[PDB]
């Protein structure tokens, strides 16, 4: 279905002598593929997925030069923000950016994104029209007028409609057999007395990729909506993920409950039950 | 390829 590219950028100022740390991470279909970190010994963009090994040295050199430019842009911007909010000079402050594009199967731009946050709060964003800005507070109004005056939206619109789209296309072609890879979940149910005559049934899914997955519990053909605990999907650390969902049930009825596991890599959704 | 910002904040 859809495809996406994003670059997530962070600059964090530090009270000491050090310049802010600037980190940029690129994503294609939610998978990290490049990263730049100013704290590294030799700061440069690096590949973070195998299929990016296809790009030549000019790609990395010029993207690195771009990051260096961004790094200065974020430094200037952070100093401006200190002034806008009349903040004191001995603190730490975070500026973030999210940019990118969503595509259709036919390679049309569905939606472009260019937005910023300061101190974890939305600051300013380019509207879906790619021409106007939504500013969240008084400081952002200053930025908004500067950018309206200098016609900044036209430059971002050009990037989002052109380069973002065109490079995402190229990356998807290069990462075809690599992006399609899946690991199916392996699932099982565990049984945990906790009783006022009750037990927790916990349905586990392990070793799966990508992270997207749905776990359901049911009783006698009905989905169980409430009283069901669902942990955030978590990385195993080896490139696979884990998740569980649990329900509290009456002692003696455990066999009546079934868990279902839906995942892309599967041929069919898994269905399972506590097996004593 | 990554975006490049124009006028600063």
């Amino acid at each position, epitope marked *: 279905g859809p495809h996406s590219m994003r670059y997530f950028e962070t600059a964090v100022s530090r009270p000491g002598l050090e310049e802010p740390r600037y980190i940029s991470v690129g994503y294609v279909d939610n998978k990290e593929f490049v990263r730049f970190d100013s704290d590294a010994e030799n700061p440069r963009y690096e590949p973070r997925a195998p299929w990016m090994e296809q790009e030549g040295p000019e790609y990395w050199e*010029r993207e690195t030069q*771009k990051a260096k*430019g961004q790094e200065q842009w974020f430094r*200037v911007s952070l100093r401006n923000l200190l002034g806008y909010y009349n903040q004191s000079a001995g603190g730490s402050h975070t500026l973030q950016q999210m940019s990118g594009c969503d595509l259709g199967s036919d390679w049309r731009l569905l939606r472009g994104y260019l937005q910023f946050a300061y101190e974890g709060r939305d600051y300013i964003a380019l509207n879906e029209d790619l021409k106007t800005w939504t500013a969240a507070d008084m400081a952002a109004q200053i930025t908004r007028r500067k950018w309206e005056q200098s016609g900044a939206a036209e430059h971002y619109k050009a990037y989002l*409609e052109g380069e973002c789209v065109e490079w995402l296309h190229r990356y998807l072609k290069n990462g075809n057999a690599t992006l399609l890879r899946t690991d199916s979940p392996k699932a099982h149910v565990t049984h945990h007395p906790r009783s006022k005559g009750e037990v927790t049934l916990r349905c586990w899914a392990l070793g799966f990729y990508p992270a997207d997955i749905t776990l359901t519990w049911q009783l006698n053909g009905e989905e169980l909506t409430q009283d069901m605990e669902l942990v955030e999907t978590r990385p195993a650390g080896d490139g696979t993920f884990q998740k569980w969902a649990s329900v509290v049930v009456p002692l003696g009825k455990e066999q009546n409950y079934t868990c279902r596991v839906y995942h892309e890599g599967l041929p069919e959704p898994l269905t399972l039950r506590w097996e004593p | 390829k990554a975006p*490049y910002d*124009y006028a*600063p904040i």
Partner: T-cell receptor
Amino acid sequence: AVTQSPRSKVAVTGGKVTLSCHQTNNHDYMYWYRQDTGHGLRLIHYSYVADSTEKGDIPDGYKASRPSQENFSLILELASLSQTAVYFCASSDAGGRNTLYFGAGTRLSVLE
Amino acid sequence: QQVRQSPQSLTVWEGGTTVLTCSYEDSTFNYFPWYQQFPGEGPALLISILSVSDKKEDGRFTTFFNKREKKLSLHIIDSQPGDSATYFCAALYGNEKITFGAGTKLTIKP
């Protein structure tokens, strides 16, 4: 505004020369360019922050100094005949695509 | 040198249309500002255009961009004396530093 000082300078070969630039634009980037018989804008040095500088395309024979956000100077320690030229300072908001705003030029003649 | 600008000097008759052209080597260059420099002054941004556009018109000045030829041009219609100046084409990719051509000095003589 971007204002350069002096407007014109005559110097002896092997003499020290300092060309000054003052910008009131609150811009962080500053540049020194060289123009020859009315042609070219060749970057000598630039600076994106109030105490360091970076080499441009033709830095040899010149040093640069950024003592302040408003001030960027070009230094010729031992002026040579080859440095007879017109020098232009510029400022920009954040480099890259941001418009460069230029001073009016300083003509330097180096004589024996 | 990445931006090639010829000729060194050009004269065209008052009222005529000047065509100034430049070529570039780097096919990735995507922003193209022209700067105008009057005698005794510094350059100032005249007009600019992005790679996504074919032309940008402003009054009597029009920039054209030709991706396939890797050519820029500036057209001045009804060329008048006050337009005589040095015109610099320029080019960059992304946020990289600007590269200037050598400049063409234009004479509008009546």
